[PDB]
């Protein structure tokens, strides 16, 4: 689609950076950005990245199963819901998850305003 | 204020109505509303309700396993992500589903602007 392609473009970029070094994701978040990771609530790039960095695993790889997006308003922002697998420490057994991002335009890219993450037992 | 309690109340109302009589979910949607039901994309209360009513089951029950909510902006709107089990008809084994709602404050209540729904398979 368009919003699915627009959302996918950014999401792939986001996960590519997450999988190579999640400590460098700061630029994709802003001061008012919020992260709710398995109920843990963080606000701001600093605290959000700290949380992601703190996650207990060396290597991680995201495998996307489904991705659905819609314009979050008439003005340019996008809402995307993703379900996929998290492969950690080079382990074959996947850890399924569901995630939602509220993306705000910034130049030809976006930054994350809302990030909601949940493990989703398989 | 309490967007967590707001989400609990709205989602409970929504799924209760969906499980009771989905043909009456119309007033929770508006003309601009968008529903992505798996591969189906609909806009407007009429088409959205039509799609939900077309689902060929006689009985359905939503069982929430996770619920998260964050303010979608500084102006009152809310983002809600839900994951849970969907029991269709007399099927014993439930299906996993994930859903995100972007709720807009309609004066003194809310309506769904964004509705993204997906069944998740292992």
């Amino acid at each position: 689609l368009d919003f699915n392609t627009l959302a996918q473009n950014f999401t792939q970029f986001y996960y590519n950076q997450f999988d190579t070094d999640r400590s460098q994701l700061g630029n994709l978040y802003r001061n008012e950005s919020m992260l709710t990771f398995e109920t843990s609530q963080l606000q701001g790039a600093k605290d959000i990245v700290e949380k992601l960095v703190s996650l207990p695993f060396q290597k991680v790889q995201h495998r996307i199963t489904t991705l659905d997006a819609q314009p979050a308003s008439p003005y340019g922002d996008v809402l995307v819901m993703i379900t996929g697998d998290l492969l950690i420490d080079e382990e074959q057994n996947p850890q399924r998850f569901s995630q939602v991002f509220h993306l705000i335009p910034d130049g030809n890219s976006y930054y994350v305003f809302n990030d909601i993450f949940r493990l989703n037992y398989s | 204020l309490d967007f967590n309690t707001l989400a609990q109340n709205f989602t409970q109302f929504y799924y209760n109505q969906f499980d009771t009589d989905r043909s009456q979910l119309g007033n929770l949607y508006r003309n601009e509303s968008m529903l992505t039901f798996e591969t189906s994309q609909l806009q407007g209360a009429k088409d959205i309700v039509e799609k939900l009513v077309s689902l060929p089951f006689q009985k359905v029950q939503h069982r929430i396993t996770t619920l998260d909510a964050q303010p979608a902006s500084p102006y009152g709107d809310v983002l809600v992500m839900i994951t849970g089990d969907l029991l269709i008809d007399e099927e014993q084994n439930p299906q996993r589903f994930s859903q995100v709602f972007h709720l807009i404050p309609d004066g003194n209540s809310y309506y769904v602007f964004n509705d993204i729904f997906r069944l998740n398979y292992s």
Binding site: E32, M34, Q41, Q43 | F3, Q70, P71, P74
Partner: peptide, 5 residues
């Protein structure tokens, strides 16, 4: 504990 200014 999510605020805006």
């Amino acid at each position: 504990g999510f605020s805006f200014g």
